[PDB]
Amino acid sequence: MQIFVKTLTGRTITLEVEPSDTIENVKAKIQDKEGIPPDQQRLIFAGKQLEDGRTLSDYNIQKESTLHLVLRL
């Protein structure tokens, strides 16, 4: 399924994911597409900071949902 990742720069990238995918794997996908190292990535959805070990389905992230990417040093 397609999801959107909104960056602070104002740019939004599209990811192809499955609800069974872990947050860690999503961050890996972001690295492959944009080159941002996972340890610098903070993902936000529905006011929650997403935890690496959990899956997208755990957070009820549906298709065409938008995640917010904030970078930590």
Residue numbers in the entry: 1 to 73
Reported in the publication:
During ubiquitination, the 76-amino acid protein ubiquitin (Ub) is attached via its C terminus to, most commonly, Lys residues on substrate proteins. Ub has seven internal Lys residues and an N-terminal amino group, all of which can be ubiquitinated, leading to the formation of polyUb chains. For the remaining four chain types, linked via K6, K27, K29, and K33, very little is known, and proteins generating and recognizing these chains in eukaryotic cells are still elusive. We found that the human HECT E3 ligases UBE3C and AREL1 assemble K48/K29- and K11/K33-linked Ub chains, respectively, and can be used in combination with DUBs to generate K29- and K33-linked chains for biochemical and structural analyses.
We crystallized K33-linked di- and triUbs. Examination of adjacent asymmetric units only allowed one possibility for K33 chain formation, although the C termini and isopeptide linkages were poorly ordered and not built in the model. The Ub moieties in K33 chains were related by translational symmetry and, in contrast to the compact diUb structure, adopted an open conformation in which Ub moieties do not interact with each other except by two polar side chain contacts. The distinct conformations of di- and triUb could be due to differences in crystallization conditions but highlight the underlying problem that crystallization may present an incomplete picture of the dynamic states of free polyUb in solution. We therefore turned to nuclear magnetic resonance (NMR), which is better suited to analyze dynamic Ub chains. K29- and K33-linked chains are flexible and able to adopt multiple conformations, much like the remaining chain types (Ye et al., 2012).
